[PDB]
């Protein structure tokens, strides 16, 4: 109980992250647990858990943030297709996205289904910007079931 405080106090700069990461692990905390997770990286696991588990969403955003391997995030997203992170993927679509509007993020998308949510996405981001084509390949995926 008094671990997270002390987390934010002292024991994270002084304590050893990889340690009390391990002993999270052990614990399995998971608002912590997450916390070591990404201090602790074993990120396939973590990702899977959190798909699984019912989860906390700052740390989310820090972890989802924290790092040009949302890509592996993705991955399990597609693994782990669970409407609880389509349109999550997409809210870090504006995490990701918002600092590097990759094209390979939206190909992803464009890859399985490409049902709602990157579309609806960049229904204003990229829209409101240049590309033609993707307003193209955009419509087209509002012809996945088209609303005129």
Same mark, same amino acid.
Not at 20 to 44: M, N, P, S, V, W
Not at 116 to 139: A, M, R, T
């Given at each position: 109980?008094?671990?997270?405080?002390?987390?934010?106090?002292?024991?994270?700069?002084?304590?050893?992250?990889?340690?009390?990461?391990?002993?999270?692990?052990?614990?399995?905390?998971?608002?912590?647990?997450?916390?070591?997770?990404?201090?602790?990286?074993?990120?396939?696991?973590?990702?899977?858990?959190?798909?699984?588990?019912?989860?906390?969403?700052?740390?989310?955003?820090?972890?989802?943030?924290?790092?040009?391997? &949302?890509? *592996?995030? =993705?991955?399990?997203? /597609?693994?782990?297709?669970?409407?609880?992170?389509?349109?999550?993927? !997409?809210?870090?679509?504006?995490?990701?996205?918002?600092?590097?509007?990759?094209?390979?993020?939206?190909?992803?998308?464009?890859?399985?289904? &490409?049902? *709602?949510? =990157?579309?609806?996405? /960049?229904?204003?981001?990229?829209?409101?910007?240049?590309?033609?084509? !993707?307003?193209?390949?955009?419509?087209?995926?509002?012809?996945?079931?088209?609303?005129?």
């Amino acid at each position: 109980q008094v671990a997270d405080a002390i987390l934010g106090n002292q024991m994270f700069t002084h304590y050893d992250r990889a340690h009390i990461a391990q002993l999270c692990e052990k614990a399995g905390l998971l608002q912590r647990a997450l916390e070591h997770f990404t201090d602790l990286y074993d990120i396939k696991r973590a990702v899977v858990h959190t798909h699984l588990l019912n989860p906390e969403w700052l740390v989310n955003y820090f972890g989802s943030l924290s790092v040009e391997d &949302s890509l *592996e995030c =993705l991955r399990a997203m /597609l693994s782990a297709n669970i409407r609880q992170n389509l349109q999550i993927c !997409v809210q870090v679509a504006s995490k990701y996205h918002e600092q590097l509007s990759t094209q390979s993020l939206i190909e992803l998308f464009e890859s399985f289904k &490409s049902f *709602e949510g =990157l579309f609806y996405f /960049l229904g204003s981001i990229v829209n409101f910007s240049q590309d033609p084509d !993707v307003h193209f390949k955009y419509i087209q995926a509002a012809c996945k079931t088209g609303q005129i």
